[PDB]
From a paper:
the clamp in the DNA-free structure showing the ‘DNA-free’ map. panel: bottom view of the polymerase showing the ‘DNA-free’ map. end of τ is in contact with the tail of the polymerase. τ500 and the fingers domain of the polymerase. between τ500 and the tail of PolIIIα must be stable.
For processivity, PolIIIα binds to the DNA sliding clamp (β subunit). structures of the complex in both a DNA-bound and a DNA-free state to 8 Å resolution. exonuclease simultaneously binds the polymerase and clamp. conformational changes from the DNA-free to the DNA-bound state.
Residue numbers in the entry:
A (entry chain A): 436 to 653
B (entry chain A): 74 to 218
C (entry chain A): 799 to 926, 938 to 1088
D (entry chain C), E (entry chain B): 1 to 366
F (entry chain D): 7 to 188, 208 to 243
Amino acid sequence: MAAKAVIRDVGRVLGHPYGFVDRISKLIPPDPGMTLAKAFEAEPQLPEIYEADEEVKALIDMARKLEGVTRNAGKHAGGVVIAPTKITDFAPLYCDEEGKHPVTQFDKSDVEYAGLVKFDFLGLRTLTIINWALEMINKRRAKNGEPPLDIAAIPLDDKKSFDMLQRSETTAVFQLESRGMKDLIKRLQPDCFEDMIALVALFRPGPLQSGMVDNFID
Amino acid sequence: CDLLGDELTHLTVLAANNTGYQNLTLLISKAYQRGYGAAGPIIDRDWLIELNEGLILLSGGRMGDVGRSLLRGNSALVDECVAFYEEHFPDRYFLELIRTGRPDEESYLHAAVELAEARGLPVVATNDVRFIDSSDFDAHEIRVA
Amino acid sequence: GLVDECWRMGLKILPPDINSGLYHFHVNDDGEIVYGIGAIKGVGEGPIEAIIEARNKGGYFRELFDLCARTDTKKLNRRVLEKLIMSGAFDRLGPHRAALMNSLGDALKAADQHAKAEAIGQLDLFGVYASCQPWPEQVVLDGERETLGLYLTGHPINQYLKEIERYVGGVRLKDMHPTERGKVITAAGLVVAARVMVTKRGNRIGICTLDDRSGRLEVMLFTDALDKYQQLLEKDRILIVSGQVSFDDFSGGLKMTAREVMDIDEAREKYARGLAISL
Amino acid sequence: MKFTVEREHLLKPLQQVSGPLGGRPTLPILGNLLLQVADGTLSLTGTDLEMEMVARVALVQPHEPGATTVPARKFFDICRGLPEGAEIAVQLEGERMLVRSGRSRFSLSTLPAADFPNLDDWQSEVEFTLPQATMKRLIEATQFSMAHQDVRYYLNGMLFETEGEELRTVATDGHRLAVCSMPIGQSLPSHSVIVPRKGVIELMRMLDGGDNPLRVQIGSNNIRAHVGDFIFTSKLVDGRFPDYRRVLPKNPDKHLEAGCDLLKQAFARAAILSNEKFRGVRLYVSENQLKITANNPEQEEAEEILDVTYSGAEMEIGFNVSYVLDVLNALKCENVRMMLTDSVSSVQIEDAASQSAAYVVMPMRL
Amino acid sequence: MKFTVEREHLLKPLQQVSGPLGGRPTLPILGNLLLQVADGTLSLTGTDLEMEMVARVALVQPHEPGATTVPARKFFDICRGLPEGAEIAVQLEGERMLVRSGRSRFSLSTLPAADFPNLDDWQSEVEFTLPQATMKRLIEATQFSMAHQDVRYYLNGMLFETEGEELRTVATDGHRLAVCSMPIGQSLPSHSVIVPRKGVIELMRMLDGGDNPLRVQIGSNNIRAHVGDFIFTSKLVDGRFPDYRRVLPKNPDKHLEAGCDLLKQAFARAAILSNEKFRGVRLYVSENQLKITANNPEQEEAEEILDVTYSGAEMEIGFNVSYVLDVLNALKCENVRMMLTDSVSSVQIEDAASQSAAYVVMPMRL
Amino acid sequence: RQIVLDTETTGMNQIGAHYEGHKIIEIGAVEVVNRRLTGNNFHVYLKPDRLVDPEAFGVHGIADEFLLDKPTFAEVADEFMDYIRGAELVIHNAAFDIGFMDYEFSLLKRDIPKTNTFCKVTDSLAVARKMFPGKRNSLDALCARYEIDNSKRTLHGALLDAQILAEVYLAMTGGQLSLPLAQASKLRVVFATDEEIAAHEARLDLVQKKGGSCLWRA
């Protein structure tokens, strides 16, 4: 039960129409880990409508009792685990409505702490991108009989690469698409791979608001 | 079970040792592999025949096979139901007893105590707890809903 | 976002084509890019495969009629055909788009009559700018956005304003200068507008689009002037503004609002334009 | 306004005029009646823009002119519900109509006569008179072949062709055809007009099958029908009806007769084991023998053997059985004659002994 | 496997057996009948798995045992369709059923008898026979008050309760209630069973009112009706019908009597100007006079005044007119006696001549 | 004896105290006995002490200059108090009206307690919400639901709504009533066997050795 969800769900069960309750939930800040204590500090209208509205009070008092509580199994799984013997030697299964997609009844942290090694599922489609781009590059082979291209075999000082980077044309360049990050690239004009390793570690609230980024650049 | 048709009953299932634990793990997997409807996954009573050793059984109380049959007042049905546990789970099948002020509890309880003495079978009491404090009842009601 | 990047980098880029198109976006030799079929909102999966399958069995489709005969109405429905025209899928063949929209049904009827001649029907008693130039640019491009998502050939006013601007929208707004709510300069390239209501009153309406090619939104709770600012806001091929921005709490739409307005002439005030000639 | 009438004079008109009215139309006033007392006359006008029915009933007691309009449905139900022989005194007062009978007293909300769409009076073009019973035959024999919701909007209705000494009716939906031709015994003008599905339903409805002549006036875009002092007028649509002479089988050389009711009971039965979607059946015919077979997805089969009179070559042809069952039921005859050309062309179906009614269905290939 | 019977021995059985079928049978074999030939007896079952019909007819012509399962509706229609006096010959060949009549032959797909689910034989607890007529009155008199879809699914049905020599039925919504009691002439043990609405509908339909007596058996989980050689079997719904003796008015102090037909005529007419959904009409009673009034949201107004025998105190009461017309339609009697209490209580209603039927409806307070 | 009111005001505060800084302009109430209008309507207009809010103006229209000469709440305090005291107070969005009422009462400084202490305030919206969950239960919503027109009626403001609400109220709380209806004795005690007790001892040893406590052995 995340902040937005718990408010929505409690509000409907308290018998308000969707309009009434959404007027409240849209005031709850976005953040991934949102709690009632955090909500009260981020949004001053929350204290105020709590004291001014009996329905809001009843609702938040109940949302406080159910904060963090687990609702259901999940649209997606957490990962793939490898046992040395049948999985039933360690856990029972949960499966979908057709008894398919069997999953361990213990979650991520718990299942591994109970002794089986796990391997994460990953949704990102950057390797799908590379895949498709490699297909498309290697088509250019028969068009001029050029050997198929090995992204692993590229040189580590490539000027075209660093030219485009110093031009700040790094939207759709993986992880580095932020405007802030492009602000940094512009000022820095990063010219080597070491700098590339650094970027994501520098591009954070701590490094920026401690002057180490500026020291480094200078 | 085929005796009560589509009607679902409540059951508490304990693994008393690791033989039971593995049998319970198999039983759970078997229920999910069978599929289910909106009510969630269900077991066949007779799965308990083969999937048996190391497990101790609680009847479910008024909401169990025997409680529901008792409340119907079908004495033949009651006798046939218990008979299964007397064969396959001697000293390992318990009557759940509950006084929480809910419909039919005391009437069932009175009839179950009579059945329990008539069959030589044991009872255990629980409070079927769902919350910490009495003011949490309202929140649990909302949780279920 | 991606397209904006593409465009700045180069050209072609092309409307979809039933003859040439693959499953997804594809590169012909010269053509940097041609539309992937799955891009289209309305068209089903079955119809996309049907189109390609028919292209496989036949060669390139010679005409609209030829397409309709090879892929029966059963696979490619009239509703489906209508969106394909609106996408610009047919443009090559039927230079007259208007002509092609109308010609579908009659061409379909013949093909079905061929099918009927074949099988399971009841049988019957009896009995029975537009030029080489296509549909106009402004209007055609309008339709494409509705169907595909974006304007082709860049916006109805796509080509620069940069020195005022940043063209980044929500993606820029995330990491912004700190304040209560981001202070921002927006120019609108194109807007189609009214002042609406509800039979109670209602807060709206600004329709803001942010170019260069970036992104546009409904918004959503504003108002200021009552009707005077509303009509200044109004309507074809003009606007630059100063407006206060917040990043919306809810995802899938932001606040970009017109607090202030300036005219083309007022935008031409913009600071004060200077003349630059490159000789 | 004030008149008082005998339930029995008012009741059949009320029924004839109300019965096609939807309780709740899309345009409110269409569910109300225009009431006019002028001279010693009540004129009733209720419409749906497509058709209009006008009734007059003699006012033998004191009366008072005015205009009013009350909900049609509700008024009809009220009058139907009234006791036998009831003398009802109603009086319009401002914009409430008070309805009395004995000790019953009513008060109805009212919408103004002025709001009622007065459609146009027009000049008659072709005129003729006929027994009510002939009109009903003409319509019954033919009306079931109209389409429901076909794009060819002029098939929801009937071609009128009046030529020489004959009046003829024919109706079709593109898939089956019915022709009826009957002598009217007067020289008429030449005019064609297509009247709608709903018009034909209502004309058939008011054919109280007896003696009374029916006089009808067709205009260029309007039609009006009087039987006595019951008056029906509908708007027409004009467009391009198909030519029955292109549908008529050329010279059907082969003739096939069988007893009609036995043929019909047998087709009703073979229909049960037919493909659910098309109700399709296959006929195999040979010298003095007839074999009808069907089949469905359920893998059931039908075969019929019966004795029929058939001399001629064997023939293979499929139909939708509902379409032939429709004609066999309408035809109340002993023996029928079927005239085929071939499997790909029209077949004419008719009483072997009469020709007043004629039906053609085009066949299928399964 | 073979048998031969004549169409006319099969017609009334077949009609009767085909009634319970329409269930959108999800388990497809519910749309089929179980045929068992054993001895010189063909047994049929037609069922929705909650209720069942078995019939035996003796076979005089040649037969051979074996069993099959054909689709019920389609089989019923074919046989009903065959001509009067026709001798129809049926024969199972392994996995297909052949239907012949003289020279026509039909071959239907078949589902095996051996797959057809069997609801168990059970034992009877209370037993009685009676004239059809008595059972007819009993059902007709009460069935209209059954709920269709209620949370209290046991009310989707009728309480059967025996006591002395009375069988006594009640059916209800929670809003209106009818009770009917008749003398049965036999000592009856006390029993309580609720038979499902679908059950009572079908039972109603099997009564021709003729001379064959009805003989009934009731067990713990099923109820069965034998009239001659036809047998109906249904299951019962579990129980806990609320006590109608609690809701009864305790000495309703006002007596109000009127001619049933006149009264019913006035309600039907007044109903036309009530709220379409809720049908709320208001009643003013005074010394020997009845004033009915009705209002609807569109400001339309009905009034009926009538001469009514009534001794008692003046009071006003409003109620749903549809529900009271339902009872007036079930009351097949000359005059009705109404027993009232006050503006906020249900009223008790009887035939002015018989205590046999009793009706009580709740008021709406408008 | 049943008392119906609906008060439309000089607009409202959206946040916090909807009554703070605001004042009542018109009081329009109908008195209901035995679910009928006697026709003894109490319809009065009072002193604004401030400007009518643009919102309230658009709701049903009303000029500030019209309520200037009209008396204040102090002039009809006793008059209105006795009219409603010790009766049934049925209000739509009771928090709104009651809030204003008690607000004005305290401003008089006349020791008059809050109306909720001597009158039973019952919200009709709560009832409607119970009956029609997740449906629009506004006045105009229910109006359209039961096919009542409150828009093409000349009365704009309190008396309008009061009348309409009365009819609606009675309809919902009439609607058709329903019939419906809605320890000693010997007994075995399986005592753990010696083998089970050995397993118990071993299991407690585990609890204790791993956790540093066992309340069973304390």
